[PDB]
Ligand binder design. Sequence first.
Ligand SMILES: Cn1cc(-c2cc(-c3cc(Cl)c(F)c(OCc4ccccc4Cl)c3)c(=O)n(-c3cccnc3)c2)c(=O)[nH]c1=O
Lengths: 299, 295
Amino acid sequence: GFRKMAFPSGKVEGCMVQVTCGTTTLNGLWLDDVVYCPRHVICTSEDMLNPNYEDLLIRKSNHNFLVQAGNVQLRVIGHSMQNCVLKLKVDTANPKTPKYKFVRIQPGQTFSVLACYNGSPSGVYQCAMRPNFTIKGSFLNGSCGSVGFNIDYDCVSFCYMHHMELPTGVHAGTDLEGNFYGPFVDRQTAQAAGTDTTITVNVLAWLYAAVINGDRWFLNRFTTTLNDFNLVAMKYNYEPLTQDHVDILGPLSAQTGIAVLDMCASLKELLQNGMNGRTILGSALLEDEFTPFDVVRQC
Amino acid sequence: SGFRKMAFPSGKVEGCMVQVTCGTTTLNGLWLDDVVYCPRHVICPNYEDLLIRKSNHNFLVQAGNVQLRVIGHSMQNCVLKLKVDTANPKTPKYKFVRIQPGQTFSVLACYNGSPSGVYQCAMRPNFTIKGSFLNGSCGSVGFNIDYDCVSFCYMHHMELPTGVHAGTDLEGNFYGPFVDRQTAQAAGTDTTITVNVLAWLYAAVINGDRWFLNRFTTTLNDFNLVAMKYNYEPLTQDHVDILGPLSAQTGIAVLDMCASLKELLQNGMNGRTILGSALLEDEFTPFDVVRQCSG
Ligand SMILES: Cn1cc(-c2cc(-c3cc(Cl)c(F)c(OCc4ccccc4Cl)c3)c(=O)n(-c3cccnc3)c2)c(=O)[nH]c1=O
């Protein structure tokens, strides 16, 4: 069938530690001899509205950072800040370090989240970067420093580190170079996410998946132009579909024989009619958290 | 805040997955101490005489890029136990358990000894699971983690025509009325897991999705007569007491929430969603909702 699978979390579990600074404890990512964690681990609650992190970090000494992997304590021998991520240099390389790289992902892209509390992982789930650069995750207090990743062969690509929960209940974070996804800042001042839209190219990939698994009830005889489609789909809060999106789908189009702009016409009709009580691949809603790359891997 | 289908972290189980090959067939095996566990249909039907002709060296056992010499074999129900020359140094604290319909577990899907994805499943009332499997997945395993102890509960044996999957516990007993043979087999008519739907409505409330709540209450009998009408599972008194912790953390008594559910069963949702779903979700247990939404 088609289930939203996460990646096996084992390679990431071996990297999670807890980082303590004063009364603050959150999770860090231990790779080689560096521990990475959100820089607000150094913050007090009075500084939260307008923290001066450079001013706060220059006042800290290595021995102020208690880093703990399992039962073991790690000695911090250096520290530096990169954008919104703090990098704590430690005196012993992590022997469980996998092959890895850091990558900045784009809206529509999917990844797995290892939700951790006190450096101990508690669950893993699949997630997508929304077009408004938030993620609809599942995070409790203490989850800061949890990370999102993909696994390709044996290479863990780290793409997200969790920093905060916005007022609307969605989550905001940075890449592993500390740059936020979206217009957010690690400050407790008012900030709001742009209106969230549906990831059109992902919905289409999911329909192609439905056709591959046997389900054709939503297909119609029509075709459309790219500009006719975008004019209709914008009215439903769908992301504009670009010629690049059209190119990304070509393999699935070839595999099923339905041209991309035919499938677009079926999606136009589905938006107009709703499900009429039916389901596609076990869902009564249009699914937008499977990329074209995903569909092919599990189909 | 937020609510997701969440699996247990699979690291403790990844360290136990291996490929087993008998002739042409290659499927995944579970390596604990000095034994590899896998479905007995990898020997291919009569298995008593079929296994008595296979020698230890009929079974190629690859643990990653290393070879395990099979030095013994044994069968327990539908599961093959291959004794190997050396114990798995990554063996977690573990036990074998059998789960009940309605209970959930995580699944580590493998392909040629290679674990490739993890997802959270529920044992259906008809004893099947709606999993995502492609060829090579057999012997992929289901488990729960509690503390540091892995409870293994599921080993996958076969796909079914409906797209659902059938398998055994780690002692080789099937879940449901299925046999590991090429015979044509059909899943029984499924039913919805009522206590899970209710735990999920509780998760929706905890997340601020409150629209489906109403002033009323009901009775188990009046409610249960509407469950049978909608192909829902009988709600029992044990179910109510199990939903107790959430009943307090929110102020919604369980038969109050049942009035909400009866009223959603009757009239559906007015083009509305609950926790981003257009359907009533029944794959989260009361325990699942607690471990995720409070601590
Ligand atoms: C000390 N401390 C702090 C945290 C921690 C900090 C935060 C957090 C971090 C930063 Cl930089 C903030 F600007 C922030 O104000 C949010 C806000 C309030 C009002 C208006 C707008 C905004 Cl944006 C919050 C957090 O959001 N969470 C969290 C909670 C629930 C789910 N996910 C994340 C947790 C922690 O986990 N451990 C630990 O010891």
